[PDB]
Amino acid sequence: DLPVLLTDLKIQYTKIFINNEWHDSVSGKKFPVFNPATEEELCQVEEGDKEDVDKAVKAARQAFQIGSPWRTMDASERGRLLYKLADLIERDRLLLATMESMNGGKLYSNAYLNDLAGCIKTLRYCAGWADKIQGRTIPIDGNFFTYTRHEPIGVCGQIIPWNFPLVMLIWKIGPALSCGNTVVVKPAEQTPLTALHVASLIKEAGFPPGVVNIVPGYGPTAGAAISSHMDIDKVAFTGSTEVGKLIKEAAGKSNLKRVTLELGGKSPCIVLADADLDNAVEFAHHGVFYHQGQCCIAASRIFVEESIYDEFVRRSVERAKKYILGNPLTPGVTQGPQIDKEQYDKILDLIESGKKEGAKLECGGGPWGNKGYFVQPTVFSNVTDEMRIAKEEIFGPVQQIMKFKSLDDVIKRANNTFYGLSAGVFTKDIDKAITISSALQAGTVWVNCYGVVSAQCPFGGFKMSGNGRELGEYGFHEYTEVKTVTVKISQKNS
Amino acid sequence: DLPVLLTDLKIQYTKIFINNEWHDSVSGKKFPVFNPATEEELCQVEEGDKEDVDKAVKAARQAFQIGSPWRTMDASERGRLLYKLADLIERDRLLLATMESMNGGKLYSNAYLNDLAGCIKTLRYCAGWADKIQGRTIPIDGNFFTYTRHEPIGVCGQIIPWNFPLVMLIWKIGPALSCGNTVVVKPAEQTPLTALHVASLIKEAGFPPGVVNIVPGYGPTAGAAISSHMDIDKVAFTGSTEVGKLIKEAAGKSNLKRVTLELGGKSPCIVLADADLDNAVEFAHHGVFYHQGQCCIAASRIFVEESIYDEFVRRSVERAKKYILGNPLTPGVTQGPQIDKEQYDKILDLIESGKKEGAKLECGGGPWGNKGYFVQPTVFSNVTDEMRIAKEEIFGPVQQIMKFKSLDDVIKRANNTFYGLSAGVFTKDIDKAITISSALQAGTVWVNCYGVVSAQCPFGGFKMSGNGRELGEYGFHEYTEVKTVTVKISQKNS
Amino acid sequence: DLPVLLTDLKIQYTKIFINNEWHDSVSGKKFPVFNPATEEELCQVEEGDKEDVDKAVKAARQAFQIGSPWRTMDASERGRLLYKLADLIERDRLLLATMESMNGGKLYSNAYLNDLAGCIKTLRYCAGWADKIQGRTIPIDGNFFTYTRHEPIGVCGQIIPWNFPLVMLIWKIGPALSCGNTVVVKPAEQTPLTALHVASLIKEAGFPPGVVNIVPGYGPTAGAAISSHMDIDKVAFTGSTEVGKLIKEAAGKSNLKRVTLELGGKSPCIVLADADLDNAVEFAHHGVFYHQGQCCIAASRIFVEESIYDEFVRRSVERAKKYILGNPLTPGVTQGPQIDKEQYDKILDLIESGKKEGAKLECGGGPWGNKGYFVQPTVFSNVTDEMRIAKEEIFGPVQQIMKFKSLDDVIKRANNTFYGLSAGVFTKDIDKAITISSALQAGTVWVNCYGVVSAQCPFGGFKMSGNGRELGEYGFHEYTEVKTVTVKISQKNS
Amino acid sequence: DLPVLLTDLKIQYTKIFINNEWHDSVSGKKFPVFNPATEEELCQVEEGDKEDVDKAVKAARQAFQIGSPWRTMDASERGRLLYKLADLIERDRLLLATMESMNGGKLYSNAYLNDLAGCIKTLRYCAGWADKIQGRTIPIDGNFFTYTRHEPIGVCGQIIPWNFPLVMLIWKIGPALSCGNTVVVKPAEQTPLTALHVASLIKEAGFPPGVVNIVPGYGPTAGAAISSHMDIDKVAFTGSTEVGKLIKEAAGKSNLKRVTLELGGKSPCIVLADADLDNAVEFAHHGVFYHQGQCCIAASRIFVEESIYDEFVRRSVERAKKYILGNPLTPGVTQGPQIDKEQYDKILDLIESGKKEGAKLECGGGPWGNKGYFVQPTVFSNVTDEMRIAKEEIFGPVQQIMKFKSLDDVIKRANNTFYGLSAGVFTKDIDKAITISSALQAGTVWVNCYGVVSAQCPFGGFKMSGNGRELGEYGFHEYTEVKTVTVKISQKNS
């Protein structure tokens, strides 16, 4: 069932959100926000800069002070507020999915059934953890009583990408708030709108002021201000590996703030000759084409054993030739645009390198349409390991298919990258499934599927795809700071 | 009981340790190693540089390969090797304590009864964790079987300081090896000797070659090579906050390697009027003077309620006037030298700032002796919060004593620093002990004691005193990399 | 704020609840249900017996089968259903609190503000755990992949007491359902009504049929049928220690079903001479008098240091002389009746033993009123350790106050019982608070408070006060059954 | 390599062990101890009875008192003593393996390479846990500080079986001592000798007196005394399900002591048509024949898909026809005797029922030899589900092989028992391996192997095969008692 908004979407929230009130930019400047499917301007939004990040950090710092409502309320009540926020997003699901689709160039069907559902589910997951964050009592040597407090870290700067604006907003603020932190959020310049609507719901739910502050603006300005701020305790960033290196450097340069990074990938699939071929073709297809290829986990190197390689390529090409391009709000449309011009150019450039460097073009290979940043879905076969399309993250609807004959060699090829976000193994052999997944240097390894991500799982990269993990039990560790308290006593007993 | 070595100490191990064999420096260069209590040269050691770190990373990488002995042996056997290494250090305790004291300027009594005991105990603690590192099975949404592997990260560069060369060597390699990593260790330029002897014992114990590689040399050369290396997965550094910022920046600049930092402090004590005064005087005294003040946790700001301030100052001064300076090997000597000239100059300079800026000099305040980097134990009273001796880490035998009258104000003063390693609270009030320890922004808070550190406790800093934790259950997390494995199944059941 | 039901309470749900439908008793027999404050009959309820427990076990067994909706739905959805049930109880809070007060003889103010709030909060706590129940991956010796599943146990029989019918219903079904079990609940013969209303809400919330089955009836009949049933996997019982022994024996005799027991107590308080005297008097007063003394944790032995004993006794007596007895529905009433005649007789008998055995009667000591099972609030001083009122659980509004002079001796006296549910320590001394709480053989020890119980804490007895724990992280273990799965593989890697 | 004792074994330790000293029985009576391979008497041992269990409980109680050496020593030192005990057993491995083989009728090769190795490894595993047993700090509702202590329970009675006397002794005392308990051990009447030698090593290692007390004697006398004792806090029993029911009943009848039970089984294997047939034949063969079939996990129902059934039966029969019966000390001997006459008679009786009830006798079926309790290794094919040999635990070298054609049906057959200790699944299908292991009601499920047990894994039964788990992280829970400590504070902060 796909319900829709019956009235025209109205844009209301366009300002900076600090202390639960709406602020104009200190400068007074605004910046435009566009629809990627028509290239038209949707509205203007206050452009946050350093001076505005500064106001937001002071509010988050004040809300984090010992004795404050956010520090003294029951953990169970932090969880209650998060579950109420999820309820409010459920109530506004139609308008949120519409705004996300319109602003993000995201198929409305997916925005409604996947993004919004994942936002609600992840918030509810995080809410349940709030009063279950616990320290230890420890049998230290000597006559002492030792316990630990897993405290919130403090003020957390959180820089959100444009490919999944709502899901990634919730993946950031959910755990941070559950653990008792306060946050300064910087949504992507391309997609500030849905985060500002959620800010309106954070007010409605009753979060104390300054617990969540949202500062739209640009990366090199507001994002850099966060990463270099001397009173931000931790920065979490999701985006390119190139910016991730800059975030980590600025943290070292300023105040040694803690850093979590969720970065790009060049994630491989290994399809053994004994695999369920149709199952592997479909999971690897969606694994690389999902959201116009704009997933960091994109299955952008697909290695197929020689004896099924040609059959795999044909079936992949047939699947890719079935899309309907156009406005992601129209029912039946199955591929929307890329997010903006910068990404669009890099995709087309990489596609050209595939042609020149000798990859076999099976379908697609060019732009589409009169308006919008549309790229034809493209499949390359006979890709080799030193081609650009095999080394660089494309972030577009561009599939690479490679042949292998030796299992030892293909694992080394799969691992021969600086990336390491995810991988897939397709086989019917129990031993191969366990040993290959163990040997891949990747944060998530899927067996006989791809792209399966849920709130209960930790998620993050090996190597240059990331530092740290998000979600699951394990992800919640990086939103606490562990304090050891050791008390002298006359005599301990076990 | 204080047994001693009956024969003259002989220095044997002076070379670089890679793949369980002894290497000359690629350059062929050596550097001198001195005794800080006499300023004489003890021996020469091969000077590792980038080319030597390079050989060590390739050995650690090869030892980490899937299928290798270190990757395939039982976790219980990793633990067995660590317990055997502890046995071997116990066997060589006399010579190790002598070498540590001679090279490190460290009171032999402490070297034998505390450093060596802590090395043995921490190794035995870490050994017990090896086959108890576990992942999860997770009830993910949908028809999937999801488990996690807490794998070793890989090759870990570990830069060891000179104030506790053996303890910090073991605090680094213990957890790293227990979790299955391989390491490239860089001991301090001042104190390479005891780490090279332990390397000889790692060979004897039977660790596979390349699991532990030790490259003596200088910070700006070998240490920088580690921090910027493109095939080191994680760097752990203990030392100054200034170098810590450089380590973190170089990690961001190169390969986004994971970073753990244990840095300096300006740790405060708060002594309430109802405290056991003698107990507070003695714990705070040793808290700041231990190992000639060369502890990152040094209790270098001591705040005393006005009505007991003068009594606290007198009793502190009497305790400080009781030391016997000289060679740390002679029995009855109770204060050895500072480690080297650089540290010695910074201490004397800061002591001079105390005189000029108006602190009340109660005892000490100058150098001592014909030879050795000796500083008189010094006490300053009437210290105020913007003096240099109240803001900068001294790392010398220099005690600061301050008065307070308001508890709200003194907590803000205690927290008004970029440091945050530790703190102490001295009181008989149950509520004050809990609420004050909760409000201090410090990684370890001691109640009615100070400086109590043990293998069972996590240990690390808030703010610019550190990133991450070492030891305890929680410290072992930062030597694993979490992989999620998600398997498609026909139907799951709870 | 104390809102009330504006309309007369109507009783609707009076039948056995199996497979989400209402059943008459197999026999066709019903039993009466009374109001303890007027001794009048409120209604009749179907009397479940063995044949009815049998129907309920078969339904719970079928609902637990592999492939069933309850076994295959996402853990997150089990949690969702529990949070919806909490929402429904919130909606029906007025009628539930009224029915609980009317049926249970429970002060309406407490029923509304404490019992109902605790029901809602505990359900919400348990809901959060559902998709956070996890097993392990384990580095077993040899070439194997080993993981564990923390499965639900299966069909759990749950026998609920009459002193807190709703809270204890939720403390049982919350964790059991969160972990994926199915249940057969047997509410107290005295108080079946609120559990049957909740059953109506379990239907409304959408739990699959047979996941929760509720069989009202008598202990020796339906309760014994559960404890001896050959296809019930686990029994949880809260009630007297005498019945607890019978439950455990019948489990051994039949099918070795798992057993959790939450039983009575004779819990002690130790009030040191340095205690906040008013704080100790008030917490110990409510600790023994709460809900007409009908708490298993009742603070029924209060030991006071000699020098403050007389002052403690006077202040206690003044507090006890302030109650207003009567119908627990009338505002301003502060003490309702005992639950029934059996309990009423045992209370009066024990009160008489206090008079005869030489206790000093300070106030109360007899019955009250024309109707209802009312007991005057009673205080005994000069109680000695071999009196009946110091050894046997009274479960009535009867306070015992004892003198001590030696701390070693009073701890031995506190521990000299077969019970061990809880205890309290009142002191301003940090060391005494830690060492005394460590030395008491009791499941919960309160320091400078009493009776503080919350969903985040494990709760249960030492010794003959109980087996196992309920709630908290730790309580959830006893609603899982751990399965180890060990898979042969060609070669493992860490 | 199989080294042997060069000198005749001398029996020295034959008395009751209490408070680290050797006691004669209160009665003065002794009982004989036999060799099962020759039926000759090896020595006499003091016969412990109730009066002797009484002396042992008082010693264990005194050793558990608050302030005692065992209660106050560092947890790390409890671990140290356990690692030293493992060292001492390693030193005495030859004599211990000889005594175990001689007393137990156990193949010396297995006694040396498996039993003794498992004793040493399990002790070392348990030692590592000692200072890693931790409670929690908990964010309770309201202004309170709440922590938990995972205390030792207290005095634990431990009844050890005769099939693995040393391994099961260590599986019991290892975790109990690691957690800080004191124990009263009752080795099997048939095999007291190796436990008394270990007691001598517990003295040598330096355990405080009364921490371990060992009372040889008979089940209905000393074992019943333990199970009914009013001052034993917990009983752990391994043995038959029939005695397990009596242990659990006596616990309920006396003092509600905690109970852990490791009982028998009728564990099934399911061999799918796609299995590695040779691998399944060998693992299932050893799974049922190990230690003359005297394992509770014996794979005593083997279900094989029809199309490979005949091939499976032939290959099994060939493997069973390869044993050499005789004295388990002689090299090359591969099957020793059953433990005693009672077990020997039950085995032969059940074998006769197989003949009469219509099972196809493939080999064996009778006794062997002039002396010793020897049974020919026996294989039955065409076994059906209501035969005695398919329902009752045989505990002898008797293999049952069954045919199945329907997977749904064979899982129901596998689960159609009151037992539930373990099971095996043999297949090459990933989905079948996961779904079948999930659906089996068994505590350990092996995939493509059988009988793989190690210290890092929890181990125990579903249903009437057991209550609770031993070893692993999870097994250590049942040797602690959780105490919640809740402290009133003026204001909490997260």
Ligand SMILES: CS(=O)(=O)N1CCN(C(=O)c2cnc3ccc(F)cc3c2-c2ccc(C3(C#N)CC3)cc2)CC1
């Ligand atoms: C949020 S909760 O669900 O955890 N729980 C909180 C506690 N509850 C109260 O109503 C309550 C309130 N005030 C008190 C004041 C003094 C006192 F001694 C007790 C109380 C109790 C109380 C405490 C323990 C019990 C048990 C026993 N035996 C475990 C049944 C029963 C009632 C029920 C709701």
Ligand SMILES: CS(=O)(=O)N1CCN(C(=O)c2cnc3ccc(F)cc3c2-c2ccc(C3(C#N)CC3)cc2)CC1
């Ligand atoms: C390291 S350990 O301490 O964990 N443990 C490893 C297993 N042990 C073996 O000797 C062993 C060896 N080989 C086998 C081969 C096939 C087989 F079916 C069983 C075995 C067993 C084995 C397995 C289970 C049991 C129990 C039962 N019932 C739990 C008592 C007893 C013996 C003892 C030492």
Ligand SMILES: [Cl-]
């Ligand atoms: Cl911790």
Ligand SMILES: [Cl-]
């Ligand atoms: Cl995990």
Ligand SMILES: [Cl-]
């Ligand atoms: Cl587990």
Ligand SMILES: [Cl-]
């Ligand atoms: Cl706990």
